[PDB]
């Protein structure tokens, strides 16, 4: 990584987000005027310290980011390192979270929802073609490049949990968001590209209903709901939903990863690519709107 002072080359500014051991700031490159997002990742530095990320996990995220180039995945521009942090200069994605943008609309049909879902599928299809599992797919990691344009472009971000799956599975404990992780993550079982497909099922469920399918009243209950595949198309939220949409979701929310729909099959599923007009017109049904997001946020 570049062992120089990032401040010699960039002006940094507004914080855009921060988790544990990472903060993301807006920045501008002095030599070009172009804007980026700078992600400062705290290194733990010593193996016995608990005050940061393993420099090896960082190395993994950077090596994956350097390989990927696709219009629905975030681009890596440059990497700096100082004694305390590794700093990723990333493509700036400023349009906000997809679901926040969708919460502003009065109405959304299934057909409209698939135009955004298809961009997610396209990005994940690229990743899985490279045998890369993202492992942290959830609404907050699905951003918009520009929310004003007629067809906004989706960017998948945050490759902090992403792994190359060269053996078909990896045996590592993944600490993801309970609502969105697959049962094999909850149960500390071997993990593959299939885990992303589960997360896509959860995102799609929310995309049509405004409700979270496995969200329980305690964190452990949510994890148990996931492990038991306990969800329902509650008629309060899925009254309008087409059978094709429910079939697409049903084929992703499957406990056995080997029986789950693949990214390739999901792109060929009739809900995504209708085979006749009867199928296509069933996607005129209502997806999520402004009132469904607020009906479930009321809990
Ligand atoms: Cl938000
Ligand atoms: Cl990270
Ligand atoms: Cl095992
Ligand atoms: Cl069901
Ligand atoms: Cl299959």
Swiss-Prot record:
Induction: Up-regulated following treatment with IFNG/IFN-gamma. Transmembrane segments: none annotated. Residues 10-272 form the Protein kinase domain. Isoform 2 is expressed in normal intestinal tissue as well as in colorectal carcinomas. Residues 289-298 are annotated as: Autoinhibitory domain. The modification Phosphoserine is found at residue 286. The active site is at 136 (proton acceptor). Ubiquitinated by the BCR(KLHL20) E3 ubiquitin ligase complex, leading to its degradation by the proteasome. Removal of the C-terminal tail of isoform 2 (corresponding to amino acids 296-337 of isoform 2) by proteolytic cleavage stimulates maximally its membrane-blebbing function. ATP binds at residues 16-24, 39, 91-93, 97, 158. Calcium/calmodulin-dependent serine/threonine kinase involved in multiple cellular signaling pathways that trigger cell survival, apoptosis, and autophagy. Regulates both type I apoptotic and type II autophagic cell deaths signal, depending on the cellular setting. The former is caspase-dependent, while the latter is caspase-independent and is characterized by the accumulation of autophagic vesicles. Phosphorylates PIN1 resulting in inhibition of its catalytic activity, nuclear localization, and cellular function. Phosphorylates TPM1, enhancing stress fiber formation in endothelial cells. Isoform 2 cannot induce apoptosis but can induce membrane blebbing. The autoinhibitory domain sterically blocks the substrate peptide-binding site by making both hydrophobic and electrostatic contacts with the kinase core. Interacts with KLHL20. Interacts (via death domain) with MAPK1 and MAPK3. Interacts with MAP1B (via N-terminus). Interacts with PRKD1 in an oxidative stress-regulated manner. Interacts with PIN1, PDCD6, BECN1, TSC2 and STX1A. Interacts (via kinase domain) with DAPK3 (via kinase domain). Interacts with GRINB. Interacts (via death domain) with UNC5B (via death domain). Interacts with UNC5C (via death domain). Belongs to the protein kinase superfamily. CAMK Ser/Thr protein kinase family. DAP kinase subfamily. This is Death-associated protein kinase 1. It comes from Homo sapiens (Human). The chain holds residues 4 to 302 of 1430 of the full protein.
């Amino acid at each position: 990584f570049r062992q120089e002072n990032v401040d010699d080359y960039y002006d940094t500014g507004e914080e855009l987000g921060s988790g544990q051991f990472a903060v993301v700031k807006k920045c501008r490159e002095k030599s070009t005027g172009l804007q980026y997002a700078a992600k400062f990742i705290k290194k733990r530095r010593t193996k016995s310290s608990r005050r940061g990320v393993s420099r090896e996990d960082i190395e993994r995220e950077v090596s994956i980011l350097k390989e990927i180039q696709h219009p629905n995945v975030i681009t890596l521009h440059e990497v700096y390192e100082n004694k305390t942090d590794v700093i990723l200069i990333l493509e700036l994605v400023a349009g906000g979270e997809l679901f926040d943008f969708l919460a502003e609309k009065e109405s959304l049909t299934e057909e409209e929802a698939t135009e955004f879902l298809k961009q997610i599928l396209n990005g994940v299809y690229y990743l899985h073609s490279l045998q890369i599992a993202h492992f942290d797919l959830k609404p907050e990691n699905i951003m918009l490049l520009d929310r004003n344009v007629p067809k906004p472009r989706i960017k998948i971000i945050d490759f902090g949990l992403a792994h190359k799956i060269d053996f078909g599975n990896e045996f590592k404990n993944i600490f993801g968001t309970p609502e969105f992780v697959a049962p094999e993550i909850v149960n500390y079982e071997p993990l593959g590209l299939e885990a992303d497909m589960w997360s896509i099922g959860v995102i799609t469920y929310i995309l049509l209903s405004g409700a979270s399918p496995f969200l329980g009243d305690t964190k452990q209950e949510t994890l148990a709901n996931v492990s038991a595949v306990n969800y329902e198309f509650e008629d309060e939220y899925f009254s309008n939903t087409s059978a094709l949409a429910k079939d697409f979701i049903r084929r992703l929310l499957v406990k056995d990863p080997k029986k789950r729909m693949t990214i390739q099959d999901s792109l060929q599923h009739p809900w995504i690519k209708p085979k006749d007009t009867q199928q296509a017109l069933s996607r005129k049904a209502e997806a999520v709107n402004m009132e469904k997001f607020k009906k479930f946020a009321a809990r």
